[PDB]
Amino acid sequence: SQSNRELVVDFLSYKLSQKGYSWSQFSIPMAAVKQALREAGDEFELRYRRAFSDLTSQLHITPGTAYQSFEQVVNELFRDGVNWGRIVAFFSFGGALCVESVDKEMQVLVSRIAAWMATYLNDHLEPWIQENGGWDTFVELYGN
Ligand SMILES: C/C(=N\Nc1nc2ccccc2s1)c1ccc(-c2cccc(S(=O)(=O)NC(=O)CCCCCc3ccccc3)c2)o1
């Protein structure tokens, strides 16, 4: 999808803005999915992410690191399969890897992390999203 590409892009830009970094590595129901996912991600970071294993601990992200490394770590969010919260967490996770990377002046890694997210979302998560009524059902379940 291209739709999903802009979600990842929307999410990462919001998060970089929010946490105080440049988001300029990045140059209706869709504004509505964006919002719902934005807020979802904030609620997950606020209330919940504290409980989980730091998956950022299990991926010292560096210029050498490739998609399989990424994939293998995100796979830990989905050993029991996909659900909406785990998808929210997946976006959280990416945002996190963007904050660390800019915090590590590797600002260029960002767009690549966004590449990986769009690949991972599209290869593994999409089959579930569609089965479960797509993003419009997420919004209905997590709006406001
Ligand atoms: C380890 C991990 N995440 N780690 C992360 N690290 C970072 C760092 C930065 C940003 C995001 C993350 S996410 C992980 C695995 C699964 C999930 C997850 C994410 C979102 C939602 C959910 S959830 O909604 O599906 N909830 C759970 O999985 C917990 C439910 C536990 C029920 C246990 C139970 C047993 C028997 C009877 C009743 C209940 C899981 O996170």
Swiss-Prot record:
Motif BH4 per UniProt: ranges: 3-23
Effect of D136A: No effect on caspase-1 cleavage
Motif BH1 per record, residues: 76-95
Protein's UniProt keywords contain NAD: no
Position of sequence motif BH2: 127-142
Post-translational modification: Proteolytically cleaved by caspases during apoptosis. The cleaved protein, lacking the BH4 motif, has pro-apoptotic activity. This phosphorylation is partial in normal mitotic cells, but complete in G2-arrested cells upon DNA-damage, thus promoting subsequent apoptosis probably by triggering caspases-mediated proteolysis. Phosphorylated by PLK3, leading to regulate the G2 checkpoint and progression to cytokinesis during mitosis.
A GO MF label: channel activity
UniProt note on tissues of expression: Bcl-X(S) is expressed at high levels in cells that undergo a high rate of turnover, such as developing lymphocytes. In contrast, Bcl-X(L) is found in tissues containing long-lived postmitotic cells, such as adult brain.
One CC-aspect GO term: synaptic vesicle membrane
Presence of keyword Ubl conjugation: yes
Keyword terms: Apoptosis, Cytoplasm, Cytoplasmic vesicle, Cytoskeleton, Endocytosis, Membrane, Mitochondrion, Mitochondrion inner membrane, Mitochondrion outer membrane, Nucleus, Phosphoprotein, Synapse, Transmembrane, Transmembrane helix, Ubl conjugation
Span of the annotated motif BH3: 33-47
Gene Ontology process terms (BP): apoptotic mitochondrial changes; apoptotic process in bone marrow cell; cellular response to alkaloid; cellular response to amino acid stimulus; cellular response to gamma radiation; defense response to virus; dendritic cell apoptotic process; dendritic cell proliferation
Highest taxon listed in the record's lineage: Eukaryota
Domain statement: The BH4 motif is required for anti-apoptotic activity. The BH1 and BH2 motifs are required for both heterodimerization with other Bcl-2 family members and for repression of cell death.
Family statement drawn from the similarity comment of this UniProt entry: Belongs to the Bcl-2 family.
Function: Potent inhibitor of cell death. Inhibits activation of caspases. Appears to regulate cell death by blocking the voltage-dependent anion channel (VDAC) by binding to it and preventing the release of the caspase activator, CYC1, from the mitochondrial membrane. Also acts as a regulator of G2 checkpoint and progression to cytokinesis during mitosis. Isoform Bcl-X(L) also regulates presynaptic plasticity, including neurotransmitter release and recovery, number of axonal mitochondria as well as size and number of synaptic vesicle clusters. During synaptic stimulation, increases ATP availability from mitochondria through regulation of mitochondrial membrane ATP synthase F(1)F(0) activity and regulates endocytic vesicle retrieval in hippocampal neurons through association with DMN1L and stimulation of its GTPase activity in synaptic vesicles.
Quaternary assembly: Homodimer. Interacts with BCL2L11. Interacts with BAD. Interacts with PGAM5. Interacts with HEBP2. Interacts with p53/TP53 and BBC3; interaction with BBC3 disrupts the interaction with p53/TP53. Interacts with ATP5F1A and ATP5F1B; the interactions mediate the association of isoform Bcl-X(L) with the mitochondrial membrane ATP synthase F(1)F(0) ATP synthase. Interacts with VDAC1. Interacts with BCL2L11 (via BH3). Interacts with RNF183. Interacts with GIMAP3/IAN4 and GIMAP5/IAN5.
Listed name of the protein: Bcl-2-like protein 1
Organism (species): Homo sapiens
Primary gene name: BCL2L1
Residues represented out of the complete protein: 2 to 197 of 233
